[PDB]
Design a protein around this ligand. Structure first.
Ligand SMILES: CCCCCCCCCC(=O)O[C@@H]1[C@@H](C)[C@@]2(O)[C@@H](C=C(CO)C[C@@]3(O)C(=O)C(C)=C[C@@H]23)[C@@H]2C(C)(C)[C@]12OC(=O)CCCCCCCCC
Ligand SMILES: CC(C)CCC[C@@H](C)[C@H]1CC[C@H]2[C@@H]3CC=C4C[C@@H](OC(=O)CCC(=O)O)CC[C@]4(C)[C@H]3CC[C@]12C
Lengths: 600, 6
């Protein structure tokens, strides 16, 4: 009778249902029997009826509910979930809410519909995880994510059942987490996202004054603000960072207060407790600056307190430590250079020391080894809990070890270390503004475009030179010699005296001509062109890249210091902005900004 | 596609 029932419900006709009650009573067959349910998914009668209706009025639902109550299977029938990978978990209430039918939502909850049921089927998953619509996996989160204020209002405060706002799905995300998860930078989306977020926050605070809704964290460990920063959602991040609440009852949770005004000058202090931390917990700034592949990484930093905080930190302690570090690094490299220079050529390593000058060389050596081990330890700690610096440190330590063992080879690698030691000194110009943007651009072009160009050139050059070598007739040694000669000719110095043994010299001349033409005219020119166009495309990006580089250097310096030193240098003044519900003072960290307005 | 105006 399953096909007949499905046809009856799909049609929506009331008459066909007559007689089902006595039929079930006589045969004592429940509406959740395997035969009645569709084997493919598990869909029961109610979801099918709700799926296909007219102008929000199916007109069959009450009869189905009455029949199920007659049987006495409402508990297992009204909330019967779907099976299968695609739609697992989905219940009738999810459908009713998805179809924007308040009437049916009320009628469903009135009868005992499970309001906390989770719909974690593969249809409802994040876009990156092979899904279509992620909404928090809850009826309440669904209504909040589909921009339906009335549904959320009724659902939260209903006599029969209440879905508390502070509730977490399998992933741990709460309704605010989902509402940030579906946010997009479009104006239409943000306009309702912010409104619903604020409404829901105020309602939760009103109902429960003790707890805080944004305190909750998901399994990942983030909060709505940190998650919005991580997911690159400027629209809601900017509205949460400057949230101000005029209501006196709910002013405690506000984030931006007015401090004082004199004429056109207005001075307001922002709150940055969660925004900036000293190792107590993860900070928005660290996440936004250090994580990669963020949509609006550069735009997100242009917010009223963020930029001024970076500025104040830079003045307070950023500049001094940077100059100290660069000077010390240069001095250390000079000492290393002197040590390598004064390495005694005579004898074999290690060399005995029996004079004060020997002890001077030893002092330089120990300083260099200390620097190398320090860099190695810093990199290893970073890995456990700067690739070029890692190479420098590992090479230094290996050179010292081979010096201890006894072999000439160490000097080579030791010298190589010195090369790298200066090769990256340019990267310390990053902190400087005028030359730091140029250093960042040089590093960017060097790694991305120069890797491709070099890889393109290597095989071409080696194969073409091998072809020319094969052309000549009087053979690894011959190739080894000729390759040096050919590279020297590529430099523009030398002479092609080796062609005497070759037959058909004309074609060899032509081939060398074309080789030179390609190497100098086309290959070299394209490298020139690429730099010119990239800078033009990033002409505006120059300031963005510079600001990001400045931020990352400042944050690296801040991270390096231990916790208590950070406590000493922490920026912002403790300001008692009000008294909590119990009356005790807040005493919350804040940072002050003042502007000028001639229109207010 | 995704549409928030429909
Ligand atoms: O130990 C420190 C570490 C932590 C550094 O901070 C050094 C300098 C800075 C800024 O602090 C740059 C770094 O962030 C960096 O990129 C590398 C390779 C190490 C850290 C610092 C000394 C050179 C004194 C030292 O090494
Ligand atoms: C254009 C870019 C992408 C390719 C890089 C060029 C190198 C692959 C060329 C440039 C100079 C060449 C070298 C010139 C001299 C020698 C020594 C030669 O062995 C010898 O010592 C005998 C000759 C001599 O002693 O001068 C072996 C090849 C090598 C390393 C040549 C091999 C290839 C080199 C490194």
């Amino acid at each position: 009778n399953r096909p007949i029932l499905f046809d009856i419900v799909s049609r929506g006709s009331t008459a066909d249902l007559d007689g089902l009650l006595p039929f079930l009573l006589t045969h004592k067959k429940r509406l959740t029997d395997e035969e009645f349910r569709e084997p493919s998914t598990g869909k029961t009668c109610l979801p099918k009826a709700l799926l296909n209706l007219s102008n929000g009025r199916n007109d069959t639902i009450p009869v189905l509910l009455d029949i199920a109550e007659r049987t006495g299977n409402m508990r297992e029938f009204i909330n019967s979930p779907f099976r299968d990978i695609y739609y697992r978990g989905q219940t009738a209430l999810h459908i009713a809410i998805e179809r924007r039918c308040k009437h049916y939502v009320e009628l469903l909850v009135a009868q005992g519909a499970d309001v906390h049921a989770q719909a974690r089927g593969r249809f409802f998953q994040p876009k990156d995880e092979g899904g279509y619509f992620y909404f928090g996996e809850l009826p309440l989160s669904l209504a909040a994510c589909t921009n339906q204020p009335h549904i959320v209002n009724y659902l939260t405060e209903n006599p029969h059942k209440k879905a508390d706002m502070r509730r977490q799905d399998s992933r741990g995300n709460t309704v605010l987490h989902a509402l940030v998860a579906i946010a997009d930078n479009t104006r239409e989306n943000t306009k309702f996202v912010t409104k619903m977020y604020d409404l829901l926050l105020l309602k939760c605070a009103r109902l429960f004054p003790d707890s805080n809704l944004e305190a909750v964290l998901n399994n990942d460990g983030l909060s709505p603000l940190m998650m919005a920063a991580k997911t690159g959602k400027i629209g809601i991040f900017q509205h949460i960072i400057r949230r101000e609440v005029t209501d006196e009852d709910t002013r405690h949770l506000s984030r931006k207060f007015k401090d004082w005004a004199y004429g056109p000058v207005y001075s307001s202090l922002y709150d940055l407790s969660s925004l900036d931390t000293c190792g107590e917990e993860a900070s928005v700034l660290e996440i936004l600056v250090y994580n990669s592949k963020i949509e609006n990484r550069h735009e997100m930093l242009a917010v009223e307190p963020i930029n001024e905080l970076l500025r104040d930190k830079w003045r307070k302690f950023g500049a001094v430590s940077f100059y100290i570090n660069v000077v010390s690094y240069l001095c250390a490299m000079v000492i290393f250079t002197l040590t390598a220079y004064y390495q005694p050529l005579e004898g074999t390593p290690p060399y005995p020391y029996r004079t004060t000058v020997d002890y001077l060389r030893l002092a330089g050596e120990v300083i260099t080894l200390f620097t190398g081990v320090l860099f190695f330890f810093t990199n290893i700690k970073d890995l456990f809990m700067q690739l070029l610096y890692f190479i420098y440190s590992v090479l230094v330590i290996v050179s010292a070890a081979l010096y201890l063992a006894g072999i000439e080879a160490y000097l080579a690698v030791m010298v190589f270390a010195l090369v790298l030691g200066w090769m990256n000194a340019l990267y310390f110009t990053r902190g400087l503004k005028l030359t730091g943007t140029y250093s960042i651009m040089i590093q960017k072009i060097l790694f991305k475009d120069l890797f491709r160009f070099l890889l393109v050139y290597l095989l071409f050059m080696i194969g073409y030179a091998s072809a020319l070598v094969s052309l000549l007739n009087p053979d690894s040694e011959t190739f080894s010699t000729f390759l040096l000669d050919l590279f020297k000719l590529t430099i523009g110095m030398g002479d092609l005296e080796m062609l005497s043994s070759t037959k058909y010299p004309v074609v060899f001349i032509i081939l060398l001509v074309t080789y030179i033409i390609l190497t100098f005219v086309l290959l070299l020119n394209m490298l020139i062109a690429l730099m010119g166009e990239t800078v033009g495309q990033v002409s505006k990006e120059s300031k963005h890249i510079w600001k990001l580089q400045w931020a990352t250097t400042i944050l690296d310096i801040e991270r390096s210091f231990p916790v208590f030193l950070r406590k000493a240098f922490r920026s912002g003044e403790m300001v008692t902005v009000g008294k909590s519900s119990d009356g005790t003072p807040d005493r919350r960290w804040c940072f002050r900004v003042d502007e000028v307005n001639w229109s207010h």
